[PDB]
Design an enzyme around this catalytic site. Structure first.
Site, PDB file in Angstrom:
ATOM      1  N   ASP A   1      -3.283   2.445  -5.676  1.00  0.00           N
ATOM      2  CA  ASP A   1      -2.330   2.540  -4.568  1.00  0.00           C
ATOM      3  C   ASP A   1      -2.022   1.183  -3.926  1.00  0.00           C
ATOM      4  OD1 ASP A   1      -4.451   2.369  -2.255  1.00  0.00           O
ATOM      5  OD2 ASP A   1      -2.692   3.070  -1.214  1.00  0.00           O
ATOM      6  N   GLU A   2      -2.445   0.092  -4.570  1.00  0.00           N
ATOM      7  CA  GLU A   2      -2.352  -1.224  -3.929  1.00  0.00           C
ATOM      8  C   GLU A   2      -2.120  -2.420  -4.834  1.00  0.00           C
ATOM      9  OE1 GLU A   2      -5.175   0.231  -0.349  1.00  0.00           O
ATOM     10  OE2 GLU A   2      -5.610  -1.793  -1.163  1.00  0.00           O
TER      11      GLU A   2
ATOM     12  N   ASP B   1       0.880  -1.171   0.000  1.00  0.00           N
ATOM     13  CA  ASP B   1       0.000   0.000   0.000  1.00  0.00           C
ATOM     14  C   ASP B   1       0.917   1.220   0.000  1.00  0.00           C
ATOM     15  OD1 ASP B   1      -1.247   2.265   2.032  1.00  0.00           O
ATOM     16  OD2 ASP B   1      -2.889   1.384   0.867  1.00  0.00           O
TER      17      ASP B   1
END
Ligand SMILES: Nc1ncnc2c1ncn2[C@@]12C[C@H](O)[C@@H](COP(=O)(O)OP(=O)(O)OP(=O)(O)O)[C@@H]1C2
Ligand SMILES: [Ca+2]
Ligand SMILES: [Ca+2]
Ligand SMILES: [Ca+2]
Ligand SMILES: [Ca+2]
Ligand SMILES: [Ca+2]
Length: 341
Positions: free
Chosen positions: A105-106, A7
């Site tokens: 974002d992951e 993350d």
DNA sequence: GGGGAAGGATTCC
DNA sequence: ATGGAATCCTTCCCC
């Protein structure tokens, strides 16, 4: 099986800092302005500074300003964060052939075959932190464990700039000691449903009749939580295939008039079609958020793919259907394409 | 009994 | 009191 989950940290805020180091050590707030009035709208992400003082995603901008009227307020630039994301995503493909990009974002990897034990995994996590920091100067958070779920949790524990393994010893502990509403996929609604069944830990789902559980939270949600509880959750890291694409905009003032809403719908169609990127949808939906923030949708599927002039003239027909089948006013209007070829 | 659609709804970030 | 997509659930027709 070993999963490493990444993350990025405080991501949009963080990207705004790299482009403009001046925002080091200052509270930074990234927003979406409505244009409904002055500062109308909401926050999407803030950095740690603004964040430890209460400013969080989802909150009105004027409220955020009543908390930190002296923090910096930035209009968001999705395109920019997107590009940076991809570059960082690429940096990860070095480390595994097995990758799942989950969101901007992951991502997950499947390092089972590159690292002998959890020890080498940790080091690996540190190799990747070093690398992204070297190439893009972006801090991320690493969370290692033996399934996608506990990897994410590990990462939520060490957030931000951290790293955190959860070995089987700690997994076993967490099934009976972790608040069940910190489980991914358990928001407030399901939590209150679980509190009313006395299930406040992942194990409590082992001493309740399945049928009773399946009654409160449904079949699919049940199985899920039980699978972690018996420690047999094995969902493989597979590449994500976009299943739907759309846009949705907030109207400057609320309305029931077809003519007033029409331009917003049309803008939403233009962005959605451009995002399609040489893809053809068979299914269109018009989505409306009412004055009381209830979602209302009307859709339709076609045996062939949808053309943009068809998209225009069918969305007007679905939007009509909404205003005929409901009496509320509308503040947000959009479209969503899906069922591609 | 369940697949396919259409609508609601949840939780994700 | 903003925006994105994924999954499921419920209800309906149909096999
Ligand atoms: N309510 C939200 N509206 C729009 N975007 C949101 C909302 N909540 C989360 N998001 C994000 C913000 C970031 O881009 C991404 C989450 O990462 P963040 O930078 O906020 O940091 P994190 O604490 O969630 O990890 C996700 C879409
Ligand atoms: Ca983040
Ligand atoms: Ca939660
Ligand atoms: Ca509704
Ligand atoms: Ca009517
Ligand atoms: Ca996140």
């Amino acid at each position: 099986m070993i999963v490493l989950f990444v993350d990025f940290d405080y991501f949009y805020a963080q990207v705004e800092e790299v482009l403009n180091p001046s925002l080091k050590g200052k509270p930074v707030v990234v927003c979406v302005f409505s244009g409904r009035f002055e500062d109308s709208g909401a926050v999407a992400t803030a950095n740690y500074e603004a964040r430890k003082f209460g400013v969080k995603a989802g909150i009105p901008i004027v409220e955020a300003k009543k908390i930190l009227p002296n923090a910096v307020y930035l209009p968001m630039r999705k395109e920019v964060y997107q590009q940076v994301s991809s570059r960082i995503m690429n940096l990860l493909r070095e480390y595994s052939e097995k990758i799942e990009i989950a969101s901007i974002d992951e991502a997950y990897l499947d390092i089972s075959d590159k690292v002998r034990d959890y020890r080498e995994a940790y080091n690996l996590g540190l190799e990747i932190k070093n690398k992204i920091l070297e190439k893009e100067k972006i801090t991320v958070t690493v969370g290692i464990s033996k399934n996608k779920v506990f990897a994410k949790i590990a990462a939520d524990m060490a957030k931000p700039n951290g790293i955190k393994v959860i070995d089987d010893e700690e997994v076993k502990r967490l099934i009976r000691e972790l608040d069940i509403a910190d489980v991914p996929g358990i928001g407030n609604i399901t939590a209150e449903k679980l509190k009313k069944l006395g299930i406040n830990k992942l194990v409590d789902t082992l001493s309740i009749e399945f049928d009773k559980l399946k009654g409160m939270i449904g079949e699919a949600k049940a199985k899920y939580l039980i699978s972690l509880a018996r420690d047999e959750y094995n969902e493989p890291i597979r590449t994500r295939v976009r299943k739907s694409i759309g846009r949705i905009v907030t109207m400057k003032r609320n309305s029931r008039n077809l003519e007033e809403i029409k331009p917003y719908l049309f803008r939403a169609i233009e962005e959605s079609y451009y995002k399609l990127d040489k893809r053809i949808p068979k299914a269109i939906h018009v989505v409306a958020v009412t004055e009381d923030l209830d979602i209302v949708s009307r859709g339709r599927t076609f045996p062939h793919g949808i053309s943009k002039e068809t998209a225009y003239s069918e969305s007007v027909k679905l939007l009509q259907k909404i205003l005929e089948e409901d009496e509320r006013k509308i503040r947000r209007i959009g479209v969503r394409f899906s069922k591609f070829i």
